[PDB]
Amino acid sequence: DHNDSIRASYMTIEELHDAGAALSRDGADSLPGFMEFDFFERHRENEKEILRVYRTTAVDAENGATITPAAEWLLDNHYVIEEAIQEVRRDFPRKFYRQLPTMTVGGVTIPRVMALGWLYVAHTHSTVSRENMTALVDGYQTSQTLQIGELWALPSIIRFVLIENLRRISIRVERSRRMRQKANEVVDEIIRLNDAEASAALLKQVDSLVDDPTFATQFLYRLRNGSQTSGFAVAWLEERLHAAGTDAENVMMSEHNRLASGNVTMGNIVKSLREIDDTEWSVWFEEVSHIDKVLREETDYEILDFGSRNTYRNTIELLARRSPRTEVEVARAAVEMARSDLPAGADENHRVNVGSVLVGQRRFELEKALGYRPLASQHIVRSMRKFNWLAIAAPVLLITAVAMLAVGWFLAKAGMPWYVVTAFLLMFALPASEGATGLFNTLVTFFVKPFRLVGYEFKNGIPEDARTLVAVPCMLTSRDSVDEMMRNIEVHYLANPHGEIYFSLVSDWRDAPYEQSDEDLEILDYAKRELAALNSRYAFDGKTRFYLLHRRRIYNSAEECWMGWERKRGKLHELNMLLRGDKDTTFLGGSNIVPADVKYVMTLDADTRLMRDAVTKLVGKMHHPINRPKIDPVSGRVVEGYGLLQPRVTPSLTTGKDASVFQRVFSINRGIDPYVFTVSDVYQDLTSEGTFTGKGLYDVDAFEAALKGRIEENSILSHDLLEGSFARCALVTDVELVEDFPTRYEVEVSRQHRWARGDWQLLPFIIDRARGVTAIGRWKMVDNLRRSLTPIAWFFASILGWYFMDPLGALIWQILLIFSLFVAPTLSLLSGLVPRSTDIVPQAHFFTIWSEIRATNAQVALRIVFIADAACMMTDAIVRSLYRLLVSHKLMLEWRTAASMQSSAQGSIVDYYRQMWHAPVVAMLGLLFAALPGDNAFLIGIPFTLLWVLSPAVAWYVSQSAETEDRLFVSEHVSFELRKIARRTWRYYEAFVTPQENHLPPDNFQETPEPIVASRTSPTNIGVYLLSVISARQFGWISFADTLERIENTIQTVEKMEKHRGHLYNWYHTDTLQTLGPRYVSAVDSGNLAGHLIAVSSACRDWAEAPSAHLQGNLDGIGDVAGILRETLKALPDNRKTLRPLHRRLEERIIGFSNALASVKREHEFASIRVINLAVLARDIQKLATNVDHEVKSAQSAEVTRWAQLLVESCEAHISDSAIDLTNMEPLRQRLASLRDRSRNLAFSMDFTFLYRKDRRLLSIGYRVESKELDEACYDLLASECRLTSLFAIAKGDLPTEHWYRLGRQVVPIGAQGALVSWSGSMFEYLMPPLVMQERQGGILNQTNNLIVKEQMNHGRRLGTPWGISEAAFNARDHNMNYQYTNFGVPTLGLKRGLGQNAVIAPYASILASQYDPDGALENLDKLRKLGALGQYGFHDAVDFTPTRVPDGKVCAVVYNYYAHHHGMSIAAVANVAFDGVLRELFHSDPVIEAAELLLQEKAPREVPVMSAGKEQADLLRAEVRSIADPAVRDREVVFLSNGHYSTMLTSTGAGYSKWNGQAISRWKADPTDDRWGTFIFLRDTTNGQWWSATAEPRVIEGEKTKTIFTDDKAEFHKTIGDLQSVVECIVATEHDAEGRRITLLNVGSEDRYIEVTSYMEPVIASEDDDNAHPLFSRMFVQTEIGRRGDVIRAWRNRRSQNEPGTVIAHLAADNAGPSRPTEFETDRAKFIGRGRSLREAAAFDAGATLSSSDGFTLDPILSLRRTVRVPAGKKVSVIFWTIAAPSREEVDKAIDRYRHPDAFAHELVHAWTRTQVQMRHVGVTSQQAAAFQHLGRYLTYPDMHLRADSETLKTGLASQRALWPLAISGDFPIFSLRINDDMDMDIAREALSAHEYLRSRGVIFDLVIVNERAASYAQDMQHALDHISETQRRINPADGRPHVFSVRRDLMDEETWSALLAASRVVLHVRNGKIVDQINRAVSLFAASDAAQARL
């Protein structure tokens, strides 16, 4: 075991420890491998070599080759080997790798961490285990410890060493394969020529190829053990090998090495890579770390936000790096100085707050004490901090001043009396200010690290001393909105259920002029009842979590309505005193209860949603003592502390089912990105305060002090800025809170001008030094005012610019004006393409810049076209605000009642123009005023003014709704056809559901071959059936009572259905309700059933709350059934005796009924009396259909009758729905409530904990109750259907988020973008989550779905056949045919080799994809409908296209199967498409699933990785067709035909025999030089007198341009001579032991040819040995005789005793294509031969003496018939010859009445094809393997010998007597002598025994001998291993003695027996030197090469 890998005598545990300990003091000085190199270049070369050795192996093994076990892992798992090649180079930038210390291993210097990698890949078998590395690092750290980072590099450096060994093994295994087969052709050339002179010249060249210790292994084997061998070929190999004295067998054994070791190490490499990928390294690093041992005691490092712990570690490492001190004492000396920091807290009485000096206030003192010298970046940052807010405002002002100076220098050329330049500069500097602040933000993001806040870890929830009440300010315009407000509260509670957390709602009954209208009591009482009901459901631990607080309002001092003390700040404050033991708060009596302390309060809002367990982060961060506010006693402002923490906010992807183009263009930041850790902001990294926009967390005491100290009455909501400025703020940027953006262009300007009004209202605080305001806060309000003033400045600047100046160069100024707006957003865009000073070389990553370029361009265009409207509206707002600022009005608390806009209707162009009416008028008036002066401003002004005036038009265009996944525009015809298809498909459920322990789908159901139902049930079937029932009720196909009955029956059945811990077993019985096989539980079935039951229960609740409006329905099914009837009626042929009156009458009646239905649907009130009369019309249609049927008994007439029936009970169901009492719905409410309860109970019943593998996460494939063991693998990909099950399992609570965040995510480049990688990428694995869940436009899943559907459509175009590939039952039938089942997909998204040879189309695929693309799917469905794919109950299962399984000349194949599994999905998809996805909300209407819905969404990352990559039509599987032109001048070939007990053999020229059950039918002998024995068909020319044969072998006519086909089923013979050709195909029939010889003759001449046909067969019935012993007897007992209707001759042996079998045989003439002619017989061979003649020169084929018709007890009987044919020019003649036999005479008559009739040949060819397909499927054979086995049988059945042993070894052996002693008599046995000695392959013997079993089915009898040839050490183990597989055949066959299989152990038996066996063996083979089914083909290419001239003689 050498190879070239790195192995160093594996030593196991307790030796690695000592090795590392020795290495610590004095080690290395050598390595098992090692070589001088450099990192990056070596890694790149490794990449190149791995790609090559991979691409070469892929281009090989497809042309036909044997793949080594070592190459199996590389081919199968190249993808995993790739990303491990990645994830390094990424984790080692050049500078980072440089710092690693030196080790100096013998001269050269090596990184210390990577040197340990070489020591531990070697003392293993390339296996990595956690405990091994732990022991090694423990042993190594005895003297010198491993610092932080180095211990972070072992996982990223081991993979570098591992792939190096992979390269060293792959480069050798690839070389060892091609050069192995190099000897194959050389020895072929050696054996081709029998020379002894040129052989030396040939062998001299390969002198350099003899020292390689694998060339000789195959060369010597193929020579010595091959066959012919040589005395000089193996004469130099030994002599040359004598160098180094390795003798002969040492090299033999050396090839045994370097192979098994290679395979083992190659497998171990992949196993180790998988283990490293799956294992966690943070926990292992924490365990084995040394610096963390000190930091576990005396400090709280354990529970401190692991990311923040890493921040501590980074700070410690940075301090240690730049200071002249080691790393250990940095974390130790800090503790000593922090020991004097004093406890300073309640919980903190013990322990030491080390973070107070590391990240806290005392960082500078720590740095000064430790001697650390700050970095220049830290120096400039601290200078910035010591400056203050001015360091931020100064650069922007400087840039604006520079821009102003530049523009003033440029714009000084048109006079400017200097009283207008000031105005222009003031109005232009604001875009300059925006550009300057954008540039400053970009640069600070580039150069300043973001800010992170340290917090606690509340793993068990928020504990005592921190109580949070989630006060969600809310409103109350209720009646039904209170229900969704409670839903929001419930979802928020479900978001963070852990910990001592309370929830409540704070609201206010609007603003009314009255203090209390007293009518709110009913709404208040209803709200209290809802709260009480919500309290009971979650009554756990006796915790009244949900409260309700409502304010009573007080009248405003100035005016308006009762609005409290303040609209919001008010509620917040009077809540603040409420929690502080205050009782005079005027909220309300009764509902004024609070849970005691509640130190913290969530602000939140009525719409924003919360991340799961997000509050556990903010609460811990604020409870951290460093973040606790201090409050300044002199003036409360919190000098050092964080009273307010604000979380970062990102908008939602789509506002429910509405996404307009306006949404996409004015919101760039969308989606949730898992990778981003922290975002950088200009404010927090430069001032350490953030912005408390609308949400956050505050301390009650600090907030109360800061607000009540300075706040005053009469302030607008702008309190948020003031409240944040009071104490402090801090953007945590680690907690997310989603929100939405309005889609209609009415509210955006509303909120914008309200905030502008608030900002302007903040001006008095800016202008006043008194009160309380910060200079930085003053600057931020000034910036807000500047942002408000930008559009007015721009607009008025333009207005004055085109007027005052009016030059010819005025275009440049507007160019710069729009250039500023282009510049403003684009700087942040460039922040993605910056490489940060060429960090690493990038991979393929796409560019996709067009999307954001278009977005920016459209956004700027919309901004410049709406700027006038925005400016006008918010200037009105500014004037209104300034009125209150100056005059001090009483209107400054207005929220929304402004009458300026007062929008009260939907958008319309007729509405915006009237409501705005201001900005376009102002613009046009300004243009008219400024156009006439100067006479040069019109050209510049016209296009721009036309842009502004058309503002309402583009606003209306962008306000319109757009389709994403549920509002798709489908029109009517597409929807009509989809509903029609669904209704037609639904007939299956009616047909196959009736109570017989039923209400379970019956799974598959065949149609053609005696249709049967397989009573097996799966949970997925139940779920899809329930969804189908819901969809059917939605469509109105069924009444309201029938749905209840079906649901109740299904629920009862599933309750009585046995369960294992709530889960359901894999398979069930419909009739007996018992488990079918082994008890197996799969995660897919339980997840699917739970997901569907959720929707069922939600819908039950939906129509149980108000069971009156859901009664009617839609009244659309009765139109779909009418359309079905119309379509069916068109296909009825109408050319009969009575023409077509009834068809016409039905046509007018149907169109009249359709018109009446349309008229009723047009009515709005939906009269019940109108639909009653339609039942009469339906009954009339039924009677007319019955009248049509009574005269024509066609199947389609029955279909018409059935589809009329379905219509008339559809009408009955609608009437019954209209016939409900509708007066007592309370019992119905009870029924629906009970159904909902029993449905949702089963939803939560299953427990998914036991399927969770807590070593590598993810859900296992399944569970087996036996042995209580998990299967093995897990669903390791996002593209799996289990993502619904995972979502439910994580939402239920028994799973963490690491489950969801550790599976899939891979991308494959297709087109411009990328999609999701799949295993067996059929969209069966994609479509289910869209069916049940909700998908948004911006999500990854929808984009991937679009890409995959486009790719499948393109694949369908390129292949030619219709598209759509998914798993189904492909065209292959087993014993008791069931059509089988397997998976399919597309090659691009497969990851599985062999998916390109299927070519299978599934009809249900097209309807599945109809959701995303309706038109293409509809066209594909129509294309399928053109073919035969529509059955009785809908579309069939699949259609086949692979040419191997394609029968006859048909283009395609049809599978007649219906699956209950693939039918409900179609109905669900149709319901989703037609009714705008009702099922989308049904699943998502449950609080439990709605709480975890936010794990969805996310954006497509933006950088696709791209891994390594008529061929589509050239890769389909193809069978083998043996095409032979002229067999006469070639060697013979044999084809076998057998039905299992009737076998016949056919040679290359029509010779052969027929064996029945082991006896003979026609005499046959093995004459190699004659081959003229068997049945022959003779053709004679009447006019010329010449006679010949159809095969022409016994005659041979000059010319003879023949052809031959010997494919399966039929053997085809071709022969043409003299413008006359004869083609004959011979096939054996089925069910009657009949062999058919159909002679087919065609003529293309110009004259009538008069020729005759003659038959010749010899009936012999014996035991194949008695006949060959004394033929006279067996000839004599034959009793050939012909009876009436002289076309059949029956011959049976006369009976001697009671032991003879009998087996009467007969021959059939069965004339065809002839009016009337008589046949003649010559049943006597004595007159046929002629006493001295032969077959080639016969006597009967002579003028005269023509078939004297001798019959009886003839001495030498045969069977022969003659039939003259009349074949004119251009027409056809056909005659069939039948060879039949039967054990009894009475059975012959039962078969003669089936072939004597005309035709009788078609419909048996298909039977033979089906039977041979079944036989070849029963045993794992292949067409090429079948051909090889038939060639082997040809060699075995004839005394031809071409692959036997040598001509020298066999001489001194073969006594033939020493065979019975070894139990192998070998009397009636040609014997085969496969020899094996490897024990490694164990596959050649399996193929040999499979061939023998195959040969046993074709009437070939021989015994298989496997000669074990291993030494006695492993001989017993090898014998047991081979018996493990042979014992399936060593058992006796069905009553014969012993079976034909043998095995001998070489050591025990004597040498003489082995020599005799090898000499007498017909074929000798070795397992190494060749392969089964491949050595047979090599003989034909080697044994080849004057017997041609005498042919045509």
Residue numbers in the entry: 20 to 1528, 1536 to 1962, 1964 to 2012, 2020 to 2027
Verbatim from the authors:
Cyclic β-1,2-glucan (CβG) is a circular polysaccharide critical for host interactions of many bacteria, including major pathogens of humans (Brucella) and plants (Agrobacterium). The production of the main CβG chain occurs in the cytoplasm and is orchestrated by the cyclic glucan synthase (Cgs), a large, multi-domain membrane protein that contains several enzymatic sites. We determine the structure of this complex protein machinery and clarify key aspects of CβG synthesis, revealing a distinct mechanism that uses a tyrosine-linked oligosaccharide intermediate in cycles of polymerization and processing of the glucan chain.
The CgsWT and CgsiGP samples produced high resolution maps of the full-length protein. The CgsWT and CgsiGP3 maps obtained in the presence of UDP-Glc contain additional densities of glucan chain fragments bound to the protein at the cytoplasmic side of the CTD. We found that an additional mass corresponding to 9- and 3-glucose chains is attached to the IF1-homology loop in CgsWT, while no such modifications were detected in CgsiGT.
